[PDB]
Amino acid sequence: TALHIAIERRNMTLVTLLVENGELPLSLAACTNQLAIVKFLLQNSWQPADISARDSVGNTVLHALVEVADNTVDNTKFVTSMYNEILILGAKLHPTLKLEEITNRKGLTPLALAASSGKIGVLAYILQREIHEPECRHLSRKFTEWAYGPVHSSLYDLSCIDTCEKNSVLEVIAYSSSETPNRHDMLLVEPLNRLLQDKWDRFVKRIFYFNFFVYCLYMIIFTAAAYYRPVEGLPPYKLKNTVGDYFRVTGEILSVSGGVYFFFRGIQYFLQRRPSLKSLFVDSYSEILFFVQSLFMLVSVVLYFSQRKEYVASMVFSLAMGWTNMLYYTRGFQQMGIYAVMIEKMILRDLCRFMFVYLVFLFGFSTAVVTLIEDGNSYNSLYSTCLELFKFTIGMGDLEFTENYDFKAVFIILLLAYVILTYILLLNMLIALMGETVNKIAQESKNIWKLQRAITILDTEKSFLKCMRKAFRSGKLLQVGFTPDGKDDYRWCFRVDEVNWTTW
Template identity: 45%
Template sequence: MDPNESAVSVPKEPAAAPQTFTRQKIFRATSEGDASKLDGLLDFLLAHDKKLTSPEFSDGKTALLNALLHLKNGKNDTIQVLLDIAEATGDLEKLVNTPYTDPYYKGQTALHVAIERRSFDHVKLLVEKGADMQAKATGRFFQYDAAGEGFYFGELPLSMAACTNQLDIVLFLLENPHRGVDVTDKDSRGNTVLHALAIIADNMEENTEEVTQIYDQILICHSKSVEAPGVDLEAIRNNQGLTPLKLTAKLGRVKLFKHLLQREFEDAATRPLSRKFTEWVYGPVHSSLYDTSFLDTNEPNSVLELLVFGSAIPNRPAMLRVEPLNSLLEQKWDKYAAKLFLINFLVYMTYMVIFTSVAFRREQGVPPFPVEGTVPGILHLSGELISLIGAAYFFYKGVISFVISPPNIKALYVDGYGEILYFLQGSILLISAAMYGCGLKHYIGPAVISLVLGWINTLHYSGGFKKLGIYHIMMQRMILGDFLRFLCIYAVFLFGFSAAILVLIEDAPHEHDEGWSSDLSIFSHLGETTLDLFGITIGMGTLHFPGHIACKDVFYFLLILYVILTHILLLTMLIAVMGRTVDRISTDSEDIWKLQRALAILNMERLLPRWLRTKLISRVAMTLRFGGGKQEPRKFFRVEEINWKKWRSDLSNVHREDPESNMMRLEMYGGNKRSELWNLQPLLGRLRGWNHTELINDP
């Protein structure tokens, strides 16, 4: 080729146009987990001065949230790519912590999603990248409501990990070196992670084991943290004023409740977190000290008050059987409640004698009657005033009781109807007094009804005796159960047959055959007919055949059918059903009796002056202090119990420690007396009986 000849230039291919990324394209890549489809995304963002958190790349959730929602076998290669891109654009922390904006999932962050997907690796990665561990998911989906919709886990990431039984993630969040988690933080309901665990707990064995393990680990980790001194995690109250223990009681989580009351750590470092301390063991006999914090009535809204007055709480009798509540109530009864109960009984019987005497000595005529100046007249007036004051007291007491614990069908079946009967007794007598003041001579009707109710209410005091109390409980439950259902069915038959027979009765008799009565009072009106048929049902009536019946054959048929359906069928069935009910409820009648006796104990305590109530309560517990006075003193209650499944052959104080040790030294203060836990009482002097329960009185 001639060198002077100009070379023919070959045209070059045009450079590829820069790749364009849209929200749909990015979300498609993250949904598929294909990191190659994100090649060039960083250059695109830098060229257009945009970030992954820009509005055009979000539809209520970010690409990172979308990627975490599409994990496959716990992996999605686009997650690391997105984090690297965000770090390069200076938007890492914002991307990690940008929450859902949709109202249904509002507040949910990438950390929440990683925990929900049970991906420990991604949780660790997000925390390392600056994830906010106090972010709250407050959308409708995370707000459990009364209808059972939604999924409540406490809103916080730690609560979600705890409530979904991910102990490894819980421990990582608590102990990771990157950033600490505030265990005392509350959600929108005021619940901490411990409250959330109480809510999701049930009474199944597997669930209880998981929840208690995580609950204890959170307490242990919190006690080791630098923020722990002076902060009692179990003393934090939610928006309802409930601690985790109180919330557990209110929700009826009986197995978790038992664990919390009887929690005992053997390790010296964590032993102060225990609520139970084994003082000594001799064979199967254990002497234990139980922490009474939040339990007794010396503080408002205590566990005892929640259980006893909480008529809607499930498993109430079972929770009151748990130590130390069972022994605490027994001790209250033995120490002072039994005496107060006897005094109340004597006062009430005196009132009923006065009320009955006044009712017997009523005057005839139209009230009000003039007051006689004689001694009998003055005594009669005094008796009327005492009766009226008693009625006003019962009315007031009933109103207060209904405000504290509104009555419902379930509460009546367990708590009984004693408070309602007292309320009716007082109310009806007040109505009678108002009728007396208005000059109505029929005032005596309500008065005698109140008198009957008053004597029926004396059965309330049978609760002071176990045999009578259980018998009374069984009567209550049968009346509110089988007998009430029987009355509903029987009322239909009684009214229906009474109306039918009354229709057959003519206004005047037309024939007087032999064997037929001409007494016009027989089946003369609906009330008389109903009463006659009721007498036939219970076998106390007489078969009368009035002569003024329009159709004798139909009358025969109705009367025979009524006897078959009521006297033979219904009554026989009632007896059989009630017999079966007695066998069924006899097993838990003792628990119901204990519950009603506990109700009586707390009601009597409320009537006492505060100073006297505090003094009586302090006599059933002793004050101990941990760690040489570094913590507030705690009230403890001693219970001696037998555990045949746990036998120790050594005769020793289980927690005998070096008295100079500050880790497990318990000091009891009272007057000039001071003793260590390892030397509270001579051991042999404590063994008085296999089932004996005893306390050390606070001097």
């Protein structure tokens, strides 16, 4: 369109002429860093302009402005500034309107959309912004109720940061698809960090240490019940009149109850999140395993009741998975909570792509060796020779594992070539790649600790809504500001402490 083409052309004379006589006009002008035109467009003698009018697509002026943010320091400063002048102009025209509280058709606030998009700068500013002109401090968030000097206590609005019945600032930062570029560090901002720390130290630390204790108890019960399973006859085994048998039956029913509980808590999670298959493992990997080691026990139950003795095969895998899943509860520790994150990454990246490169070698040399052997031990089987070759990779093989071969030069050449390629070369580069992975996710991922605490804190908070949803509310309904209408702004503020020396 020409009327917007001229605006995008940085033309002021034509803009004024059109006034006399982002796809929206205001949004299109704003996104181009004209700035002064925004004020000129906002009000004009020929006709005024309105920002409250939402776009057909659903993005208002604020949504459009945050849309263009591309996480650049200069870009961050520009966008946050121009956002501030847009808010100031809106206040000047009519302070009654609440632009930020206004939302798109999809129910996303500018703060929530900034969080989901991953715009760290805009979210950081909006979360904490202090206005000094008292007549214009209504729409400020980071206050300074009292600064004694060395310490300058501050108050943060935290309206939709915690108590929000919609997508909140933390929910989006911890329950999203995890493709956002800076979710890892984006919750180190001023209010969120201390809010989550307070939540944990006050209300969630016990409810988590309790869950770990109950899980350990459940796993001990399950191990004891599985270890002492009857071995005579076919299931179901009729109860016997012994204290041990009844006590074991209690253990078994506890095991099955836990299994069904985990199955349902997994199914409800997968209906709540609807994770994409391509991102099924990357995002929620600690949630797939708790579901699978309950699927195993459900299969075990159905096999056990249907006159079958293969249920042990299922139950044993469930037991091993249940024990090895106690690394999900190390997220509550910084020092030891990074080992559960190294295994997760190495099993999915370093050990998943490297298996294709290895099974090729193993199968090639296995077929070679097995065809070389006449069989005229029973080593002619492909499985047996594929297992004898695997032992070489873990340093407990034996060169002379067969003699049915007619040719001794060729067989030993093949075996030595395999040993050199896999034991000495492939292993020593897989280990090198694991070195790089450990480097990375031990030097930069030291705050996946914080991210995992955010996820578990939100999970527990959602869990205990029935117990205390409104009561378990962070922050105090304190008075820090006054509205233009004359009412007192009672905001759910969160006290904060900070110190600075050089400023004096």
